[model samples]
Target: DPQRREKIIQATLEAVKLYGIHAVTHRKIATLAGVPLGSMTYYFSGIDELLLEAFSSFTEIMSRQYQAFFSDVSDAPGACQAITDMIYSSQVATPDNMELMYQLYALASRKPLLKTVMQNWMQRSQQTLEQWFEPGTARALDAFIEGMTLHFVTDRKPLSREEILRMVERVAG
Candidate 1:
């Protein structure tokens, strides 16, 4: 069933998100998903296929939310402000998000196909930023936004809206 396939896909994502990609296996995902181990083969061709689908799902979900984050904002500075608000909000800078990101990055590093999925996410984000800034500036902003989010999550220092705004303006210039 389609719902069963979705369960397996979601379980695969959760396995990686919780245990890291290196730790994922058919048995692991099947068990976590509360499905029969034999069902893994019936649905997915292999672990890599499962991973590719899971990461794609992960990226799509995140990209949609990212778009919504900037959905109301008009100007470049406003984009920065929205990003900052998103950062400080309970949603973006949380422990759960950090762990999931780490898992996604780890999976991308090991798997070429999964890496492309991640590449698509970055490219999309860069394109969105390009509407406000030039190409190079948009690229830099994308990187800076990701880096800043990681830092803000890991470091004890709280990030301010002004700090986020200044960084975006500086890079956009």
Candidate 2:
């Protein structure tokens, strides 16, 4: 039972990664998992519920990745390095992730439910970085990282790793 649930969740994430959240469907998830369509309906009453679960899972994965990034750095400079590293990694950003994030941002404007989910993600991300900096500093760092990630993804012309580290050090100091 537990294994089946895990399989479904994994399948959901993979589907999200491949198809973007808006394109993912119950049938698509079932096909990806090699499970029967009824299983999805049985597990989740509707698409909204399934979307919420997928979004929650996505946030969990992101949280773990960021937490690991900061775990080795106890000081502010190390933390700044970790932030710079994360921004650079966005240079390899996948289209699916970008599309899904953008879609979620768009949806947040029109949907209360999606707005709440985005808020939760922001809170989690802020808390993760708070280990190295104060909440205000962490929020500021996150805003800068987000802007850098967007620029890197869109323009494919990102600040060099060293330059980003320098910027982070200056701002975070």
Candidate 3:
């Protein structure tokens, strides 16, 4: 069925999330997707092709989430609050999710197709923010969000909610 292709894409994300990128395999994806091993070849050219679609799909999912973060924002203050939530909230910024993001960055460095996924995701993030701020402001805020989230997940130090809001206000203003 056509679902098998999509299933394999989703399973690639699951496999990467659970096992890390290096450990993912065709067999693992097939099993996780509950499809026959032969279907892997039937659906995808290889791991690279599979990974491109999986990560590309993931960026779409995350883009929707990023848009949702600003759903209630109308003014600069609301934008700052939304930015704070995006940076400090535990639900969307979970370690596993961030790890998948970082893994994509590493893999994208070596794969041109994956690099396009990363670029498109960043473009989406900035465009989402552009709804509230000028293009320049939006671009700057997007970089701040990316850098701050990387620090939040990787660094031992964590910023308090107030601290996050302050930076958001400064960046958005």
Candidate 4:
């Protein structure tokens, strides 16, 4: 009979995913979460606070998913292959989730806390890459992964796996 906070957090993602950050409202989230309207304020400081938690949770979920892609990846070539494998996987770049990620990107630019969330996610990714690459190479690969995923998610014509692997290898070297 509890878990209102977790429900609200999960519903916030679905609300934002369906209606976007700007369009989502407390009532919508409350309704989606199956909690009372008053429960929203009771659980969260405000809408912004709720959003911050929602996105922060989202990034945490994504970070683990991202890390899982690199299992058994031991060298630069394996890392490149893992990156391509991640790109090719539907789980990593679903259209609905990519849209939510872009929404977070836009919102992060204006919200310092949200920007922190973005940086933390990026740093985690960079750290993951550094396990197989030098600092400089890892940083570049981090940015490349973001760009390629954005392209893969948004482009009308997706990059061929061959092309994705080629590009990953190009930067990995």
What C-alpha lDDT do the candidate models reach, one value each? 0.79, 0.77, 0.86, 0.88
> lDDT tens string, model 2, 1-173?
76776678778877877786668888998899888888887788777777777677766776677677777888887788888878788732457566566677776776677788888988988988887789898889888877777786677466788888888887786
Higher-lDDT candidate of 1 and 4: 4
For this target, which candidate reaches the highest lDDT against the unseen true structure? 4
RMSD after CA superposition, every candidate = 1.8, 2.4, 1.9, 1.8
User: Model 4, range 20-76, lDDT digits (tens) per residue?
Assistant: 888889999999999999898888887888889999999998999999999878888
Name the regions of candidate 4 deviating beyond 4 angstroms: 153-157
Off by over 4 Å in 1: none
Candidate 1 overall lDDT versus native = 0.79
The list of candidate 2 runs beyond 4 A from truth reads: 14-20
Write the residue-wise lDDT of candidate 1 on 73-149 in tens digits.
Answer: 88877877777766656465467666766677776777898788888889988877777778898888778778777
Residue-wise lDDT of candidate 3 within 6-98, one digit each (tens)?
A: 898989999998888889999999999999999998888879889989998888988888899888988878989988888887655677678
Better of 2 and 4 by lDDT: 4
Measured against the true structure, the TM-scores of the candidates, in listed sequence, are: 0.89, 0.84, 0.89, 0.90
Sort by lDDT, top down from the best: 4, 3, 1, 2
Better of 2 and 3 by TM-score: 3
| Candidate 3 Cα errors over 4 Å, as ranges | 153-157
